[PDB]
Amino acid sequence: EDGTGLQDELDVVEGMQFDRGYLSPYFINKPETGAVELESPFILLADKKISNIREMLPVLEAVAKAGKPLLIIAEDVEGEALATLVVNTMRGIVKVAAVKAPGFGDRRKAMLQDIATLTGGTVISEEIGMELEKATLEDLGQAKRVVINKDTTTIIDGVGEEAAIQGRVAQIRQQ
Amino acid sequence: AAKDVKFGNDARVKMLRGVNVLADAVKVTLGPKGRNVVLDKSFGAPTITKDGVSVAREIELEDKFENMGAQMVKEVASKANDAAGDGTTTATVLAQAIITEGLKAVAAGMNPMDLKRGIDKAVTAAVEELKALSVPCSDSKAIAQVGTISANSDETVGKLIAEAMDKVGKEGVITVEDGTGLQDELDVVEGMQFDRGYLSPYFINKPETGAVELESPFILLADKKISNIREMLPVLEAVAKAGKPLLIIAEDVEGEALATLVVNTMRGIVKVAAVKAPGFGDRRKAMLQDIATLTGGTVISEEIGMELEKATLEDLGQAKRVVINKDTTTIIDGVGEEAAIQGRVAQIRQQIEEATSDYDREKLQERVAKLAGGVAVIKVGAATEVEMKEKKARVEDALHATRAAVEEGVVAGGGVALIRVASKLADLRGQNEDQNVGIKVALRAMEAPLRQIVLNCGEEPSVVANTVKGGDGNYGYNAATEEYGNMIDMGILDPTKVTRSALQYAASVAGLMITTECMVTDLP
Amino acid sequence: MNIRPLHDRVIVKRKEVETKSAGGIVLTGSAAAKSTRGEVLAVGNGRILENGEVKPLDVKVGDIVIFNDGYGVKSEKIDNEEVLIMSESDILAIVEA
Amino acid sequence: MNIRPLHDRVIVKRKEVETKSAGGIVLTGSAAAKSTRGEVLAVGNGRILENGEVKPLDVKVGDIVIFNDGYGVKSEKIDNEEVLIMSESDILAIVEA
Ligand SMILES: Nc1ncnc2c1ncn2[C@@H]1O[C@H](COP(=O)(O)OP(=O)(O)O)[C@@H](O)[C@H]1O
Ligand SMILES: [Mg+2]
Prior knowledge:
The structure is cut from a larger assembly and holds two copies of chain A and two copies of chain C (97 residues). Chain A has 175 residues and is α/β, with parallel strands linked by helices.
């Protein structure tokens, strides 16, 4: 890429990263720049837009019981869910931030399984035998930390097994 | 489509001539005795300017190959402007000297790629030298000298600019506008101000001009427009209970709220005025948090955890007083703790260090200035509209030059700093002879800015240079007074940043340009 | 100034809308939804229809009730408070204990 | 705390929606449909229409019924559970055995 300075520079990226921003500017965990660092968060992958349909509470409350941060991946999140979310985070009930999926239907849907398997989580198949509140905290993936800014979301390390990691890579051989 | 191709010397000669035309037009505007260039426009009245970058932009050549040469040299002039906004004419001159000598080296049969490396290495060494020569610019008199020198030695310009930077502060925002009168005038604004008028013309507190002054008012910030949602009365009433004036900030206020409000203000029940937010939603919402924190108030989070009725009187921000007119709303001083004000500024540090630079930083700094600094506007006097253009343009160049001098320091003017550093680099050689010649070529090109100044003054460029070289340190020739002495004493200062940038940008384009073997262009 | 309802009309007041205690410790922000619970402020004479006797309402003042919020439910301001006016038929349930 | 219905109103709750046992062994997924089956949680006093004699409802508490989910069916949340409120007339059938 074109450099700002007159000097050549090298950048190395570790782990899974993608060009996604946060839908909740309000929730910043610590560093400024909209930076969010969640420690040992639960990761949620979904196939639908979230607005007026709040019904996912037992999944969200389950997270509250844990006392751990929640990372959300879905086609979109609107202000209704975000509004409840911002206040819940503000008082420390739950530390949760939501971001939009990778981008295009065949694009983001394809990249969701690997994110889920890498973090040991389960992708919510709206299409298949799964529903909005039908899914236990078990389903959510785990990572030691995540870095979120206005333009990008990064996962430090999702906890997943090598056989699953390698296996996802192995199915990639046809790809 | 179909192409016309030139190889070697024929290509370079055409390129050079194109460059020479561009540079010759640019050179006449360099120095105290520099002369104006007039740009023609079918749209209306022609523009006359001493600014080299503007002149460079307008030059295009009939010969396709010559045009190609001019277009490439055009960028150095334009790039220099982007960095410091000044020294663009000087940068073009360096490109002129470097290119001519470089091509001459190419003619000799030397490998231009090696020549380019020599030039590039020489440039790196020259840049390091400039930093050592650079001295801090802190006092008002030195700042005035750079402003005065930038504005083609106009003493009045330097005088006014120095007053403004000291007054507004280091992070303050200074702009320039045309003047109604024939005289130059400076306007300084303190506190939090924005270009927002009042929705209710009816509510005028004391001075007429749409002027509203509220004493110890409560400030309301909202994320919604109030049409039929008049409800919020317990909040308004709480203020009525308080007996204090109310200032309202929200996306919009309809006549329904205003109608009841007007009667309330006239008979003495409450004194309340409402104004629509800064402008665009991301921008208005972004500036609302600082307004609230500055005044000690709370922004109503319609979006998050707040409602129209829900909000106590204490939530509203407090200020000593505000000033409102049809075009603008100003707060004398919101009462907020110094730590919170500074804190908003502290979060702004990410905002300041932004990849965008142009546009984002200008607006950002304006917020910052309003938050803790000051804002200054300069009006320019002149009998006619075209005179005003020239005068105003130069003032901006001085403004950019002072900003550059403050941050990176200054070096002696008259091109003395480049010629003086050249003597230092007489010891620089590299990998092979072609590079050594390239290095040598750059050193010779350094001299040119000095001699153009003298040339424009009608005097022998070479004779003045010999005495200048003969001199020591800051010694040099003052073109305006037509005599030798200490350049610093004279008051002629070159910001280090413009001088450095000119050399760097000029050489980078020149190195690649001299290495061109073949040129491709469309047929006549 | 406490209102006297006219036969078969019951005056009740609505309780808090989407109270922040559903599903557990999760706070659900209001997203433009409304609640059917309230208390009976006043009881009318009874239902007049069919002349022979006036039947008293199967409700008493101060009860906590569940009702169907519909067109038949009217809103009035009492002592700068919100009160709803509806018939016995519109009240779906009684909350006891 | 439990619910006391307001005369002729019956409080019922639905069973499961499109349970995966239709046609035999095969599992048929949810196609965005609802179920008409329910149980009677509570019984109202009865019909108060025509003044004389308030007639008791034919349906006892704890029954399993089939009903017409029409306008006269309302939804209430009791102790964080979903319940339905409708009149006796809305209920179409009783599942006994
Ligand atoms: N009175 C002067 N005497 C000697 N040198 C001067 C005088 N005024 C300006 N200069 C020098 O000549 C340069 C060109 O002036 P300027 O018009 O501002 O060109 P830029 O547009 O700066 O190339 C200055 O940067 C400065 O070093
Ligand atoms: Mg200048």
